[PDB]
Design a protein around this ligand. Structure first.
Ligand SMILES: CCCCCCCCCCCCCCCCCC(=O)OC[C@H](COP(=O)([O-])OCC(O)COP(=O)([O-])OC[C@@H](COC(=O)CCCCCCCCCCCCCCCCC)OC(=O)CCCCCCCCCCCCCCCCC)OC(=O)CCCCCCCCCCCCCCCCC
Ligand SMILES: CCCCCCCCCCCCCCCCCC(=O)OC[C@H](COP(=O)([O-])OCC(O)COP(=O)([O-])OC[C@@H](COC(=O)CCCCCCCCCCCCCCCCC)OC(=O)CCCCCCCCCCCCCCCCC)OC(=O)CCCCCCCCCCCCCCCCC
Ligand SMILES: CCCCCCCCCCCCCC(=O)OC[C@H](COP(=O)([O-])OCC[N+](C)(C)C)OC(=O)CCCCCCCCCCCCC
Ligand code: HEM
Ligand SMILES: CCCCCC(=O)OC[C@H](COP(=O)([O-])OCCN)OC(=O)CCCCC
Ligand SMILES: CCCCCC(=O)OC[C@H](COP(=O)([O-])OCCN)OC(=O)CCCCC
Lengths: 52, 49, 34, 61, 446, 54, 425, 105, 54
């Protein structure tokens, strides 16, 4: 449990933070696009084709 | 005798950026890889739709 | 790397007389390392 | 001449697989609207005056 | 009491001088009673054409067989009688002839090197004798799978260029090479601006420069004719060559990407990354506890008999990668673990292992420059490639600059998502397809 | 060594769809094996969604 | 200007317990420390053959002060090296690292040499490495010929092979390893040599840790020359053969005579692809033999005996013609046919080769370590050249005479259908 | 050393006889769950202790089949329970802890 | 067996109306369910390790 507490294991977290942050954007944008989530999509310029 | 083994000529198959044997291939590596991956990305964009 | 010194995987062939010189011994020594 | 567009597309978007995916999911969002908008415009043009949305204004009130 | 940093300052400066005919003369003095002296020429198979390929390797067989002033045995008897040793070698870019002898035998040693480089006899009776000798050596080299697989790697990686050519040349060119082809090769390439007289050991730089004026002055230099050689770039090609031979008991595999070349500062960081992966042999003692994950896994699961990383440097190009030999059912596992370590270092290298790679390099650099002959080689080769001797204190500065960020950036620049040149030989049915190898050069998780 | 080869589940998928040695010269008439698999799955999905209303 | 510093002298010290410390401060960036031990294969007997081979392979097993994991990772972390070199007389534990890390590798060296545990399971896991080590060594045909040459020459204690007999692989026990270290790794059988290290710290280390009192005294188990022949019919392409007679123990003046005789006859080339003009053995065989071959004088000098002769490589059908031609060439020197210029050129090859063999720290450390055990002293090179100059032409002749008249030992491997027995020479 | 430490030992002997693996002839280290550390320690046992462990487990599995136990005379006495595996398992754990401490740097 | 009897209690309470005192018993049995699995049974295994001296 406490094997992963040290300098090297914090360096590994540093190296994968830019990647893990991008997969979260891929998942987030993929969730908004797949469900047509209007809360987020209404703020995008070209996808305002709703005509409420 | 293995020094007789020359590699055949692939000039009929090489892309235009890779024809000159005196020009580095690094100058066109990004463009060549970008094209085939643009084909893959556009394909995934189509299947996603 | 392991070493065997005496001159004072199929390895290869030594056929001609030029490559043979130096092969004849001249006291064994066995070295081992990491 | 600077490197071609496909070269700057590779190093900037396609090198990392994570950005390669972010490019696709973002390209899928705009492609859907642009393709559905354009494709519907071709269907309605070929069928002008026949669909209900064309004869809709006659029966407003 | 002296620290490691202070010991790098104590190494004597390498004194460099140049004659009026372009011949550079370099030396590193010490207190030794012995010394090494030689001539490094900027010639090799990369300068040869397809018709005269192997000509330099032919001249190497004739360099010690007689001169105009010392015909036949006369050269050997002088070298042997003073207890000296005479040697030579030829790569794709450099040719060298050097003598090991006592310090008092310095003037005779330089005199012989001059008579060798300038006044080679090349008797027709001797050329026919060496014709059969080189042919036997070609048959001998065929049995060394390591020499074969690395010639294949050059053949496929630099296909269509001079670097694809091997040093020995093809069997047909050694049979039809005339004396005129060889003299044409000598007058064209053995020119004073392209040679370096290097020495190391107990000797003052003055007597070397005097002997340089005394014996090498009679050499056309600084303007031969409108026949100047110039090395053009050499195209690298992602490709694969597979010599299937199931009669051999172990497979040989060499895989590599394109390296930058001699002068690029990135070679230091690349060598640090290669040192982390390191090398393995079945006679190593460490086995499972080795630091390198590839070596540990290779020893624990017995994936190979050996592997080695390499960074081969040429002018503006090179071969960066690894070579291994293994059982026919371990070629896939070995390729998988190898590529996984390239990708791991490209993306997620850590600080401690990078320090190990820097320490392995510091020990390798100082252990190699121990003896007059290694230092004499470092002097000669560096003056041709770098145009100077890079002091050990400068190598330490460039090594100390490397950290984990440098390795991740530098490894990704040359490894990540790049087309390798693959060469295989032996029972290689299980060698992965090139597309699968090419897919191992990136990670979908990254 | 390799997770794809040693895991009890992935080794069956690996030895069937990934690392299976297949001939280098099978033509388009060998595509109908997978197409039959797709048709069977395609008929089951649509078949099930029709059973929610039939 | 560009000149080097003033080179220091080698410090040398004998402790009253028999230990020998010798150090040189060369101000190099690297340091090198060697512990040389009179524990080579000669101190095995017929009940523990191969124990010193397995010991040579066990340098990274667990010690009382450092586990096997720590030794491997600890040395590699600083980019260091740990080696074990063995001869029939000595074992040499050598350690290399940058001079800022001498303390770390010294601690590992002492643990490996003075506190090995030889754990039952670690030793068992290491047994198959004997088969791999021996197989890699014995693919040089020179190795097995010289194993058999010593097996044929001596009744005991040098007949013992450098490599473990096959029947012993897996049979060497941890008790035998413990007993081997307690008996032979003692103060009066050891020498602590160091480069890039100060003399006080070595002498300090020597007095703190290397004071192991003798479990077995300096053995008087003298090697007894007997002579004989071992022949190995195999499927090699060429016949290897060595013909030898008892010559002289190392350090004696008669040993220097045989070393000069070695270079009068020829031992290894000086020119890449050269005809070897100054080698009288090679020219003597090339007279009556026009096939590919090689021939070299063999010289092996030990503490209490020696073997001098020559080594031949030839086609199977030319094996007798090559051996008889070479042996006759030694007879002409024993009959007096030896010029003074011939002896001077031999002294130049010998004197030059000795100096060249100590250019490097690796070769210098090995020479100082061997001198410390063989002689209990350090003889500088200028004194060594002085001893070579003292060899007379008559001494070279009498050494040839001792070979011609001495009871021979012979080892050969190949297709031996035309390889003579000793009595046929 | 005192009357209270005999009561802690008293309940330990109670729990020992309540655990009941002594009724099958087993020892405490025979019952341990085999993880990677335990498997290595068992691998390092000398031949005699390995063969003894194998037969006790075999005899206990034979009893568990029949739903039987040994006579009380042949039960494992708490005072005689030999921790034959603990010194080997302590050393295996100590080595792993060292590998895990090097991995942190 | 406290987990079984506590589950036999939830079974009994489940087939009864939501009225006094079944409301309180059903809440106690519900907490006892998750407390036995998450807290008590793991703690017993640790106590048992100490009594055997490991
Ligand atoms: C639909 C279900 C989707 C499941 C996705 C599973 C992804 C996954 O497991 O991550 C591992 C995978 C590891 O690949 P890697 O980083 O290149 O490392 C290679 C390994 O060392 C090991 O490399 P390797 O050499 O052993 O094998 C390379 C492997 C690389 O591909 C995979 O391993 C992906 C797993 C197969 C997914 C199949 C899709 C359905 O290629 C394959 O073998 C898959 C072939 C697919 C056959 C399908 C037949 C029809 O990482 C990802 O793909 C994550 C990104 C996925 C995008 C998700 C969108 C958000
Ligand atoms: C859509 C309905 C397709 C009806 C069946 C067409 C037969 C065919 O050749 O398929 C092409 C295609 C060629 O694949 P392949 O692996 O290169 O050769 C297959 C055999 O070895 C083929 O044996 P082969 O080597 O003796 O070649 C026979 C030849 C047969 O070619 C012909 O008879 C038609 C020649 C067209 C000349 C242009 C006139 C306009 O096919 C070709 O050489 C290539 C045809 C390329 C299509 C060009 C059409 C324009 O084969 C198939 O896809 C078979 C399944 C098609 C059924 C689809 C029904 C749903
Ligand atoms: C709940 C909400 C969740 C929503 C999530 C939405 C996410 C949308 C997709 C984004 C993921 C992309 C992953 C990726 O891009 O990695 C897949 C792989 C890479 O491509 P690559 O090899 O260029 O390497 C790439 C090398 N680089 C990176 C250096 C350039 O993509 C390929 O290879 C395969 C492409 C071929 C497409 C056809 C597959 C479908 C199956 C058959 C369809 C027809 C019959 C059913
Ligand atoms: C090999 C797989 C299958 C085949 C070849 C198949 C074929 C057919 C065909 C040809 C029809 C006639 C449809 C029509 O004329 O309108 C039909 C009807 C039907 N099938 Fe399937 N089917 C398959 C699988 C399934 C499965 C797995 C289910 C249920 C989960 C299913 C549910 C139905 C239903 C509810 C109908 C009646 C609705 C209709 O007629 O469209 N089918 N099937
Ligand atoms: C896992 C199953 C999820 C089912 C969601 C669903 O079917 O779609 C509902 C909304 C529709 O978008 P909205 O802008 O009308 O929003 C209307 C809000 N009711 O989409 C969402 O908002 C997606 C939310 C994802 C959360 C996990
Ligand atoms: C939801 C998205 C799932 C993504 C999985 C994926 O694409 O599989 C990997 C391959 C390409 O990667 P590679 O085989 O070069 O491996 C790279 C190793 N570094 O892609 C394909 O061609 C496989 C076809 C999948 C059909 C379902």
């Amino acid at each position: 449990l406490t094997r992963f507490l040290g300098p090297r294991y914090r360096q590994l977290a540093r190296n994968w933070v830019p990647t893990a942050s991008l997969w979260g954007a891929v998942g987030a944008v993929g969730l908004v696009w797949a469900t047509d989530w209007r809360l987020i999509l209404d703020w995008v310029p070209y996808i305002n084709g709703k005509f409420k | 005798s293995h020094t007789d083994i020359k590699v055949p000529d692939f000039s009929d198959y090489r892309r235009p950026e890779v024809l000159d044997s005196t020009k580095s291939s690094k100058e066109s590596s990004e463009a060549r890889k970008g094209f085939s991956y643009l084909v893959t990305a556009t394909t995934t964009v189509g299947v996603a739709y | 790397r392991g070493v065997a010194g005496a001159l004072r995987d199929l390895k290869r062939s030594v056929l001609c007389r030029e490559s043979l010189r130096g092969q004849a011994a001249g006291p064994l020594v066995a070295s081992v390392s990491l | 001449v600077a490197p071609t567009l496909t070269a700057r597309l590779y190093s900037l978007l396609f090198r990392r697989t994570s950005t390669f995916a972010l490019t696709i999911v973002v390209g899928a969002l705009f492609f859907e609207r642009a393709f559905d908008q354009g494709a519907d415009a071709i269907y309605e043009h070929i069928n002008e005056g026949k669909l209900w949305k064309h004869i809709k204004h006659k029966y407003e009130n | 009491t002296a620290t490691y940093a202070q010991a790098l300052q104590s190494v004597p400066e390498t004194q460099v001088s140049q004659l009026d005919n372009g011949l550079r003369v370099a030396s590193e003095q010490s207190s030794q009673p012995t010394c090494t002296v030689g001539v490094w020429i900027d010639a090799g198979s990369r300068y040869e054409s397809e018709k005269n390929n192997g000509a330099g390797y032919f001249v190497e067989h004739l360099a010690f067989k007689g001169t105009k002033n010392r015909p036949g045995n006369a050269l050997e008897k002088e070298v042997e009688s003073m207890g000296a040793h005479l040697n030579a070698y030829s790569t794709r870019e450099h040719t060298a002839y050097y003598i090991k002898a006592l310090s008092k035998d310095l003037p005779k040693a330089v005199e012989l090197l001059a008579d060798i480089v300038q006044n080679c006899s090349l008797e027709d009776s001797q050329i026919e004798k060496e014709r059969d000798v080189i042919l036997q050596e070609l048959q001998e080299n065929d049995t060394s799978m390591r020499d074969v697989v690395f010639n294949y790697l050059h053949a496929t990686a630099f296909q269509g260029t001079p670097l694809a050519q091997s040093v020995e040349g093809p069997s047909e060119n050694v049979r039809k090479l005339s004396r005129a082809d060889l003299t044409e090769y000598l007058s064209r390439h053995y020119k004073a601006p392209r040679m370096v007289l290097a020495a190391a050991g107990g000797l003052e730089h003055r007597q070397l420069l005097d002997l340089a004026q005394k014996h090498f002055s009679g050499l056309s230099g600084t303007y031969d004719e409108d026949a100047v050689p110039t090395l053009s770039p050499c195209r690298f090609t992602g490709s694969q060559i597979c010599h299937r031979e199931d009669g051999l008991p172990l497979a040989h595999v060499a895989i590599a990407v394109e390296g930058p070349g001699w002068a690029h500062p990135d070679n230091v960081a690349l060598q640090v990354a290669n040192a982390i992966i390191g090398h393995y042999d079945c006679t190593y003692g460490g086995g499972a506890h080795l630091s390198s994950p590839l070596a540990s896994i290779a020893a624990t699961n017995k994936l190979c008999q050996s592997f080695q990383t390499f960074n081969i440097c040429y002018a503006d190009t090179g071969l960066l990668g690894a070579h291994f030999v293994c059982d026919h059912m371990s070629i896939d596992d070995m390729m998988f673990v190898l590529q996984g370590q390239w990708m791991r270092l490209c993306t997620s290298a850590t600080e401690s292992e990078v320090l190990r790679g820097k320490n392995l390099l510091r020990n390798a650099l100082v252990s190699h420059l121990d003896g007059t002959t290694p230092v004499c080689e470092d002097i000669g080769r560096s003056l041709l490639t770098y145009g100077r001797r890079i002091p050990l204190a400068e190598w330490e500065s460039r090594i100390a600059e490397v950290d984990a960020r440098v390795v991740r950036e530098v490894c990704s620049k040359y490894f990540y998502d790049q087309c390798p040149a693959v060469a295989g030989f032996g029972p290689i049915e299980q060698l992965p397809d090139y597309n699968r190898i090419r897919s191992g050069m990136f990670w979908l998780r990254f | 060594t390799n997770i794809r080869k040693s895991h009890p589940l992935m080794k069956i998928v690996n030895n069937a769809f990934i690392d299976l040695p297949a001939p280098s010269n099978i033509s388009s008439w060998w595509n109908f094996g997978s197409l039959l698999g797709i048709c069977l799955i395609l008929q089951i999905l649509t078949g099930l969604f029709l059973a929610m209303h039939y | 200007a560009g000149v080097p510093p003033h080179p220091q002298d080698l410090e040398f010290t004998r402790l009253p317990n028999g230990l020998v410390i010798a150090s040189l401060e060369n101000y190099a960036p690297a340091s090198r420390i060697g512990l040389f031990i009179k524990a080579g294969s000669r101190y095995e007997n017929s009940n523990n053959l191969g124990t010193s081979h397995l010991l040579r392979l066990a340098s990274s097993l667990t010690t009382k002060g450092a586990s096997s994991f720590k030794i491997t990772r600890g040395i590699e972390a600083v980019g260091g090296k740990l080696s074990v070199t063995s001869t029939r007389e000595n074992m040499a534990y050598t350690v290399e690292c940058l001079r800022d890390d001498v303390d770390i590798l010294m601690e590992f060296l002492l643990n490996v040499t003075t506190a090995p545990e030889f754990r039952r399971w670690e030793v068992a896991a290491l047994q198959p490495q004997l088969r791999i080590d021996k197989a890699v060594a014995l693919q040089n045909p020179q190795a097995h010929v010289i194993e058999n040459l010593h097996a044929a020459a001596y009744r005991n204690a040098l007949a013992n092979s450098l490599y473990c007999p096959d029947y012993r692989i897996g049979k060497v026990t941890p008790v035998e390893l413990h007993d081997y270290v307690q008996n032979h790794f003692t103060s009066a059988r050891m020498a602590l040599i160091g480069l890039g290290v100060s003399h006080p710290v070595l002498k300090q280390v020597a007095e703190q840790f290397l004071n192991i009192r003798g479990g077995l005294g300096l053995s008087g188990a003298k090697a007894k020359y007997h002579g004989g022949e071992i022949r190995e019919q195999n499927g090699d392409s060429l016949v290897h053969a060595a013909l030898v007679a008892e010559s002289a123990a190392i350090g004696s003046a008669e040993a220097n005579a045989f070393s000069v005789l070695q270079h009068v006859l020829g031992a290894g080339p000086h020119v890449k692809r050269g005809s070897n003009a100054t080698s009288s053995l090679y020219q003597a065989v090339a007279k009556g033999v026009h096939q590919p071959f090689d021939v070299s004088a063999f010289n092996a000098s030990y503490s209490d005996s020696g073997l001098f002769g020559f080594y031949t490589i030839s086609q199977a059908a030319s094996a007798g013609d090559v051996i008889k031609a070479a042996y006759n060439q030694v007879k002409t020197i024993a009959q007096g046919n030896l010029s003074n210029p011939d002896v001077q050129a031999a002294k130049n090859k010998l004197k030059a080769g000795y100096l060249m063999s100590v250019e490097s720290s690796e070769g210098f450390l090995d020479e100082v370590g061997s001198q410390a055990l063989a002689a209990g002293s350090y003889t500088p090179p200028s004194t060594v050249l002085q001893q070579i100059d003292a060899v007379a032409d008559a001494d070279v002749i009498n050494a040839a005479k001792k070979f011609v008249s001495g009871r021979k030992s012979m080892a050969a491997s190949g297709n031996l259908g035309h390889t003579p027995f000793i009595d046929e020479l | 050393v005192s009357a209270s430490s005999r009561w802690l030992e008293g309940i330990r002997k109670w729990y020992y006889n309540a655990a009941g693996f002594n009724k099958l002839g087993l020892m405490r280290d025979d019952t341990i769950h085999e993880n990677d550390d335990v498997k290595e320690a068992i691998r390092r046992l000398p031949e005699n202790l390995y063969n003894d462990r194998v037969f006790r487990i075999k005899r206990a599995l034979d009893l568990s089949m029949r739903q039987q136990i040994l006579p009380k005379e042949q039960w494992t006495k708490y005072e005689e329970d030999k921790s034959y595996l603990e010194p080997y398992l302590k050393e295996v754990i100590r080595e792993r802890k060292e590998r895990e401490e090097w991995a942190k740097k | 067996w406290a987990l079984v009897a506590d589950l036999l209690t939830l079974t009994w309470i489940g087939g009864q109306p939501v009225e006094h005192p079944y409301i309180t018993i059903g809440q106690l049995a519900s907490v006892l369910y998750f407390l036995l699995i998450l807290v008590l049974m793991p703690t017993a295994g640790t106590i048992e390790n100490k009594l055997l001296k490991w």
